[PDB]
Amino acid sequence: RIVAKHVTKTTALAMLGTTIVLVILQVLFTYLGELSNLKADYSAWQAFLYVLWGAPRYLYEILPISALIGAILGLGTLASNSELIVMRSVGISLWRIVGWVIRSALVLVLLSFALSEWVVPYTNERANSVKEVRGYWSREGQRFIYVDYANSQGQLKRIQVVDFDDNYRLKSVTNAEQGQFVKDGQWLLNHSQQMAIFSLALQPKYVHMVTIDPEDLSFSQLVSFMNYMREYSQVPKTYQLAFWKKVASPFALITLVLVACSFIFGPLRQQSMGFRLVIALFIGLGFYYLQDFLGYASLVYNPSPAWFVLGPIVLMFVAGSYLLYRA
Amino acid sequence: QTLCIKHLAKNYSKRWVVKDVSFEMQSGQIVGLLGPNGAGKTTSFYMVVGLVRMDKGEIHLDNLDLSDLAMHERARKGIGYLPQEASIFRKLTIAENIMAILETRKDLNKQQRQQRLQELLNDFKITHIKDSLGMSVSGGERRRAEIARALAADPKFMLLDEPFAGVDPISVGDIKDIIRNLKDRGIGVLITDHNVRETLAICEHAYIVSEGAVIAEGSPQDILENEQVRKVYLGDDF
Amino acid sequence: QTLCIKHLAKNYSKRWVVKDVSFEMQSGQIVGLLGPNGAGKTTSFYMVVGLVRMDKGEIHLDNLDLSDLAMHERARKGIGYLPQEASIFRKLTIAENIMAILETRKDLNKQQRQQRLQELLNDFKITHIKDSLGMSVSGGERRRAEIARALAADPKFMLLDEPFAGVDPISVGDIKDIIRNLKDRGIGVLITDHNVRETLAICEHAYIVSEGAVIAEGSPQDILENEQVRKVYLGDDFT
Amino acid sequence: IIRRYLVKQVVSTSLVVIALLTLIMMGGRLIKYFGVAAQGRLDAGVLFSIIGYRMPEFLTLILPLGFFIGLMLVFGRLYVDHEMAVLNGSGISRIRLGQLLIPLALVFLVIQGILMLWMTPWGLRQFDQLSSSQAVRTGFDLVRPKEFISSGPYTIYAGDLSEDRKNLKDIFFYQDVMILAKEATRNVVDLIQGRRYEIYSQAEFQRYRLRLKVEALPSSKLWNKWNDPVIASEMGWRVFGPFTIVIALMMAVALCEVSPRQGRYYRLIPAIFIFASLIVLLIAIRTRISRDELGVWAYPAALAVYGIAAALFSRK
Ligand SMILES: CCCCCCCCCCCC(=O)O[C@@H](CCCCCCCCC)CC(=O)O[C@@H]1[C@@H](NC(=O)C[C@H](CCCCCCC)OC(=O)C[C@H](O)CCCCCCCCC)[C@H](OC[C@H]2O[C@H](OP(=O)(O)O)[C@H](NC(=O)C[C@@H](CCCCCC)OC(=O)CCCCCC)[C@@H](OC(=O)C[C@H](O)CCCCC)[C@@H]2O)O[C@H](CO[C@]2(C(=O)O)C[C@@H](O[C@]3(C(=O)O)C[C@@H](O)[C@@H](O)[C@@H]([C@H](O)CO)O3)[C@@H](O[C@]3(C(=O)O)C[C@@H](O[C@@H]4O[C@H](C(=O)O)[C@@H](O)[C@H](O)[C@H]4NC(C)=O)[C@@H](O)[C@@H]([C@H](O)CO)O3)[C@@H]([C@H](O)CO)O2)[C@H]1OP(=O)(O)O
Ligand SMILES: CN1C(=O)[C@H](CCCCN)NC(=O)[C@H](CCCN)NCc2cccnc2Sc2c(Cl)ccc(-c3ccc(N)nc3)c2CNC(=O)[C@@H]1Cc1c[nH]c2ccccc12
């Protein structure tokens, strides 16, 4: 227990220190980029508030690389002090130390979950305000609905619904000027100009989610909205990529921590602390580039984004396990 | 108990630093794995410890093969290791340092774990620093704490890497007494160190390894009067 | 020439590692700066070299102050340094290793520089391996090449850090012969080493530094017979 | 022989660092460009041309930084393996070793002058022309599978799309002209198994054919006109910018003293941040001159302030 507490506390302190350092270094580096966007209504204080409100998002996007670098630094501090060697010499396996470091990284995993569900969706809205959909086009089965204005409270302005059959022939082109939402599957409206050659599946609750990019949506919102679209429509590939990227974020963090531990016990053993930090930065940049590139490639290639998202994670986990097996 | 090691061989950069290094040890016996620097004593000792993977050879501990086992598995089988460099837990107190390894023992409960901690602290005269951090103690006190921590795991063979490294001649007697006490505790000791003169004073069986192979075997007196060893390692005058 | 060092003192993290360390070493004299580990012998040796800046004290070389001079300026004044670890230029040939420091000498032309290179290679028996890289040589050959390069720097006082470090007893005699050769070249030698026994065999004047101050002085016989050193450093039983 | 050794070491490690930093800092932007292309806002077959035309612009930052890191790597290696103790112990100071590399620093300064005065403006001109060519794409060029894309009076939905942005499936197009086609291949687009409607006219068809900067100016044109604050800022940047390899030489010498235990890469991050601060100041000054608030005189001074402060740090 004392060994476990010591390793977990040291690695958690390393992760938290790296997290604070990286969040500060990204806030003060995004502020530099934002200082060139100043105008009459966007002063330096407004830009600082916009960057600061985005701090939870920067933290959420840093937690994987933060955990990787923190594990690297903490295990390097233990190894350079010859603490891991005596830990092995007393009967503690490599996988036990890796499990302790993973227990330490579970705090960052929980922090990532809390940010993604409760903090990031709210502060992102605040950040945009410092700096509800119009012209919404949607498909419901064989019908196409274009609503010029849609409101979260249940207001529709200039709706146009065009129906179709399996033969793709016009059936009804209905239009209205104003409309209200009363229940699922039915909307009241005035000026019911229905052509011939009511029920619509749009829901106000998801209206605010249309403008938001799939990456910026919280997991609960993404699942609810994606469930709604799969029920009434076809889910786009970018939404599937976002879902597989969010559901595999804790797994990616744990795998990156395991890779850091394997590197410390393997290639990065007896190396200097500066070299370990440089290699940790290189691995973090490589991970942040591979995940982004494969996410983009999932949107252009036939295979499902699940493959492009769970490929790097599984492969890195296998590589780390093999490096740990080599001791 | 006996530790037999046969035909150790390891190559680095396609050259065999160690070629057929074999030696035998017994519990409560001091054995010195000596030889010219870089000729394979360090690599052979590390393969015995488990730091360096074994390309060729067989390690048995009382007809129990340890060649395929890893470092931690060998440690659980009854092998302890004492690194030359400072290996104390810097942020843990000396009492916590020993108790951290005492908790690993499965055949002790807390009531006897505390007693074992107290008697280990009193054995090495480190009770006065039991509440002090491991990174704020003297070299000798830190080494005694490391030895107590290693013995807290109850090893059957202690593998010491250069105990007489950076040790004044006044404090060489203390290290010799500590190693003699380790022998008297029923635990064999394998010492590897470049200071052959005071390593041959406590070791009761010495193996000299040169050119990657064992060139001599026997007591330190026999080692000194060995033509090959004086030809390669100790010189004409010693 | 006489390098005289007075009142060395240095603190590290509010702890006075070295307190009033003073000693004199003449040219052509082997002087051993020994003592218990961590008691200030290594720090005093480094401040003599110039690796770590002094906090108190002065250094003179025939009334030529070296206290404020940097390490390279002292080297230009005639002080060479031999580190314990492998300090040879890894990707430079041994002949190139010696020549690169020979080219620094402003009192030698190419015709004389080549002759000096050849005779330095000959004296240290490294002519046979003059075409190999510095990183692909044996430990003894590497140390011989480093000493040849240091002599190519033309020093008046060579400060050796742990010459008998990781050295077999067979090579201890060879290193002793090397240091005696540097003595016979008119170059004083200041040796610091953990191995007190073998260091005391060639040094003709030993300074023992304990608790940050010099406690002993004189020939190694006096050092061994000194009761204070045996009480703090050597022990009652020592040979 | 010490000079050739140092020059070879610095050139090798600095070329390695320059290639590595080029890979790192161009792969990220190329991945961003590839994401844009996968969103249909950029041709996937041209993004390589985009990153090839910005080779000089990225290199104008990688060269000062790559040289700085290579200098740090060489000097830190000299310190770690005790090759600096024997060089200082032979009368050759660290400042002397840095001065021995003045010809190499001048070679890199000439290279960076070539990039910033000629190569970078040409690359930026070609990249701006290419971006203007790629900023006009509209219609079925911007379509994404299972999504509605609105461009001008056009609304486009495609149920499927190939790996390349051709061979659409389940195509719905809205102007008003509404066309629903089973297949479509690409603005000239051939639609297969389609229906056209006017909202009321109907027409079925088996096949149908549908038909819906100062930074880049040449140095010759910017050598004069120093009165214009924007032109003055750009030209002074092009002139006083290549002198960041002289400041990367006398500062990497200052911030390279590392203990053998400390490591070769220990001091990189703080001094890389110091060099980044130098460059960030050189960019804030450039912007201030562009806004007519500071004047060109701040270009050399910003270097000299870093030139002196480094030099003093090398002589403490
Ligand atoms: C001698 C002299 C020598 C020196 C010479 C000079 C120097 C060399 C010169 C060479 C040339 C050069 O520059 O070379 C590069 C730089 C070289 C380095 C700098 C100089 C250093 C000098 C000192 C050394 C290239 C460059 O600079 O490319 C820009 C790009 N920048 C980056 O990519 C920077 C980062 C990092 C750079 C760091 C420094 C490296 C060198 C040391 O990577 C790289 O360099 C690549 C590589 O990996 C670097 C390797 C790093 C490691 C190196 C190690 C070396 C050894 C030590 C830009 O990215 C957008 C954002 O990307 C990420 O954030 P994110 O993911 O959240 O989105 C970035 N964060 C991250 O990655 C996360 C990082 C943070 C960084 C950490 C750094 C650590 C060191 O932490 C981590 O990783 C965690 C781990 C690490 C932690 C920290 C340790 C954000 O970083 C920042 O803030 C940081 C700053 O830059 C400052 C940099 C540091 C300075 C010290 C970024 O700002 O996008 C730009 C284009 O931008 C547009 C475009 O104009 O086309 C616009 C853009 O819109 C927005 C915006 O979002 O930004 C919003 C908008 O409102 C407005 O405000 C708008 C805008 O403000 C004003 O217009 O900006 C976006 O557009 C759209 C979109 O649809 O999406 C529509 C938007 O809306 C529309 O906009 C229109 C418009 O305005 O046009 C308008 O008309 C419309 O009406 C409007 N409609 C509506 C409806 O509104 C909006 O919807 C938006 C949406 O929200 C999504 O973004 O999207 C975008 C599009 O995405 C593109 O695809 O397009 C590129 O410019 P471009 O190349 O010229 O092109
Ligand atoms: C607005 N700028 C641009 O054009 C560059 C693109 C440069 C190449 C264009 N092909 N865009 C960017 O900012 C993109 C992100 C958004 C992209 N839209 N990446 C960031 C970046 C890249 C390169 C250089 N700095 C930066 S960030 C920066 C830095 Cl490090 C330091 C200070 C300032 C600053 C200046 C004045 C001020 N009051 N507050 C702040 C900034 C803000 N940025 C800027 O001032 C620069 C000024 C500039 C114009 N020409 C240059 C040529 C070389 C170097 C700099 C410049």
UniProtKB/TrEMBL annotation, chain A:
- Does this UniProt record's set of keywords contain Cell membrane? yes
Which one Pfam family would you cite for this protein? LptF_LptG
Compartments (UniProt record): Cell membrane
- Residues folding into a coiled coil are none
Instruction: Extract the InterPro entries matched here.
Output: LptG, LptG/LptF_permease
Q: Report if keyword Nucleotide-binding is assigned.
A: no
**How does the entry describe its membrane topology?**
Multi-pass membrane protein
Source domain of life is Bacteria
UniProt keyword terms in alphabetical order = Cell membrane, Membrane, Transmembrane, Transmembrane helix
An example GO CC term for this entry is:
ATP-binding cassette (ABC) transporter complex
- TM segment ranges: 12-32, 58-79, 100-120, 247-266, 273-291, 306-325
Entry's Gene Ontology BP terms: lipopolysaccharide transport; transmembrane transport
How would you summarize the oligomeric state and partners of this protein? Component of the lipopolysaccharide transport and assembly complex. The LptBFG transporter is composed of two ATP-binding proteins (LptB) and two transmembrane proteins (LptF and LptG).
PANTHER family in the cross-refs: LIPOPOLYSACCHARIDE EXPORT SYSTEM PERMEASE PROTEIN LPTG, SLR0882 PROTEIN-RELATED
Return the similarity comment: Belongs to the LptF/LptG family.
Function per UniProt: Part of the ABC transporter complex LptBFG involved in the translocation of lipopolysaccharide (LPS) from the inner membrane to the outer membrane.
Q: What is this protein called?
A: Permease
Per the UniProt record, the source organism is Acinetobacter baylyi (strain ATCC 33305 / BD413 / ADP1)
TrEMBL record, chain C:
**Could you identify this protein by its name?**
Lipopolysaccharide export system ATP-binding protein LptB
Which branch of life, at top level? Bacteria
Q: Does the keyword Ubl conjugation apply?
A: no
Question: Which residues does the UniProt record annotate as the domain ABC transporter?
Answer: 3-236
What role does it play? Part of the ABC transporter complex LptBFG involved in the translocation of lipopolysaccharide (LPS) from the inner membrane to the outer membrane. Probably responsible for energy coupling to the transport system.
Q: What is the protein's quaternary organization?
A: Component of the lipopolysaccharide transport and assembly complex. The LptBFG transporter is composed of two ATP-binding proteins (LptB) and two transmembrane proteins (LptF and LptG).
What family is this protein classified in? Belongs to the ABC transporter superfamily. Outer membrane lipopolysaccharide export (TC 1.B.42) family.
InterPro entries xref list: AAA+_ATPase, ABC_AA/LPS_Transport, ABC_transporter-like_ATP-bd, ABC_transporter-like_CS, BCA_ABC_TP_C, LPS_export_LptB, P-loop_NTPase
Q: How does it sit in the membrane?
A: Peripheral membrane protein
Q: For this entry, list what GO says about its biological process.
A: transmembrane transport
Q: Which GO terms describe its cellular component?
A: ATP-binding cassette (ABC) transporter complex; cytoplasm
Which key words are in the record? Answer: ATP-binding, Cell inner membrane, Cell membrane, Cytoplasm, Membrane, Nucleotide-binding, Translocase, Transport
- Any one Gene Ontology molecular-function term assigned to this protein's record: ATP binding
Biological source species:
Acinetobacter baylyi (strain ATCC 33305 / BD413 / ADP1)
**Cellular compartments annotated:** Cell inner membrane; Cytoplasm
Keyword Disulfide bond set for record: no
Primary localisation category: membrane
Automatic annotation (TrEMBL), chain D:
Membrane-crossing segments per the record? 11-31, 58-80, 100-119, 235-256, 268-285, 297-314
The keyword Membrane appears for this protein: yes
InterPro entries registered for this protein in UniProt:
LptF (IPR030922), LptG/LptF_permease (IPR005495)
Q: In terms of one coarse class, where is the protein primarily found? A: membrane
Pfam families registered for this protein in UniProt? LptF_LptG (PF03739)
Task: Tell me yes or no: is Transport among this UniProt entry's keywords.
Answer: yes
Q: Which UniProt keywords apply?
A: Cell inner membrane, Cell membrane, Membrane, Transmembrane, Transmembrane helix, Transport
Please state which protein family the record places this protein in. Answer: Belongs to the LptF/LptG family.
Known function: Part of the ABC transporter complex LptBFG involved in the translocation of lipopolysaccharide (LPS) from the inner membrane to the outer membrane.
Protein's name according to its UniProt entry: Lipopolysaccharide export system permease protein LptF
What is the protein's species of origin?
A: Acinetobacter baylyi (strain ATCC 33305 / BD413 / ADP1)
